[PDB]
């Protein structure tokens, strides 16, 4: 398992405004739990916690959304 | 140990823009990790998992100044 950002296709962040956002889409991935975060996107984005590591997260680069 | 949002007096949280500040308060405080996540209308506060119980959190109410 890992923390991270979670990604939509590919290497995109989910903004969010509620931590309760992020909870529910963290934990549907199969993560612990997630928080609505500084920064991963300008603003705030999902962080997940312990996610699966079949799960991809955000790394340093470019947002290419599919 | 529970999570929470760690306090200053009285009932106030901390205020942040980057997760390294809320990881070092909270781990300097015995917390696993912390984390600068959503706390309302346009801010941040920190995070903190695993926080000991000799540490305060935020309960519900407003922060009292000082």
Partial sequence: ???????????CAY???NNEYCNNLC???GAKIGYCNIVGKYGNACWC???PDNVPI???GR????
């Fill in 1 to 11: 398992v890992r923390d991270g950002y979670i990604a939509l296709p590919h290497n």
């Fill in 15 to 17: 903004g969010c405004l």
């Fill in 27 to 29: 934990t549907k991935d």
């Fill in 49 to 51: 916690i312990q996610l």
């Fill in 58 to 60: 955000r790394v340093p």
């Fill in 63 to 66: 947002c290419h959304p599919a």
